[PDB]
Design a protein around this ligand. Structure first.
Ligand SMILES: CC(=O)SCCNC(=O)CCNC(=O)[C@H](O)C(C)(C)COP(=O)(O)OP(=O)(O)OC[C@H]1O[C@@H](n2cnc3c(N)ncnc32)[C@H](O)[C@@H]1OP(=O)(O)O
Length: 153
């Protein structure tokens, strides 16, 4: 309870913060209005990790299919990386999927991006395809995937 910094849900009021983290963490470009737009489609999934009322990371998703969710933007501020924030947000994203009966979740990541590729592999994600000339700068992308449902013995 005493942990400093909790997960809340994005507000149009946080845009400059998120727009700043995305500029400085993602090679693909995202205008503020586009991010504000990605909100509208699945707002409840746009969540931020807040630390002394400063957004230090955010995730945001769409419903690709009635039951498959997709992760559109995921980023955490350099100065807070490895804090374990993005694990908060993924934990939270998955919980929300569990809640709205989304049975699996996909995403697309750059191929070169080893740092994240692991992060997701830590969370159970796996590679299913490679998307040729996917990004605007003509590099490729791995599509990663996992079921939501978990069991331990
Ligand atoms: C779909 C899209 O939008 S693409 C997403 C954009 N990709 C990015 O790189 C955005 C900027 N970077 C990130 O957001 C990083 O992936 C982060 C910040 C989420 C990872 O760090 P944080 O969220 O602050 O801490 P987090 O709890 O996520 O650490 C993740 C865990 O995965 C593993 N991990 C994280 N980074 C790495 C790495 N570079 N190499 C190997 N393993 C790693 C670690 O085991 C770590 O847990 P532990 O080190 O505490 O055991």
């Amino acid at each position: 309870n005493a942990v400093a910094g909790t997960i809340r849900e994005f507000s149009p009021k946080d845009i400059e913060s998120v727009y700043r983290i995305a500029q400085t963490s993602l090679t693909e470009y995202y205008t503020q209005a586009l991010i504000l737009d990605l909100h509208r489609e699945w707002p409840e999934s746009f969540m931020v990790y807040t630390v002394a009322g400063s957004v230090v990371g955010f995730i945001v998703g769409s419903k690709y299919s009635r039951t498959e969710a997709r992760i559109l933007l995921f980023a955490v501020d350099e100065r807070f990386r490895r804090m374990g924030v993005g694990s908060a947000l993924m934990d939270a994203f998955l919980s929300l999927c569990r809640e709205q009966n989304m049975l699996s979740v996909r995403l697309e990541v750059r191929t070169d991006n080893d740092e994240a590729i692991r992060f997701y592999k830590k969370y159970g994600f796996v590679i299913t395809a490679m998307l040729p000339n996917y990004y605007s700068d003509s590099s490729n992308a791995y599509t990663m995937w996992r079921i939501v449902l978990e069991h331990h013995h």
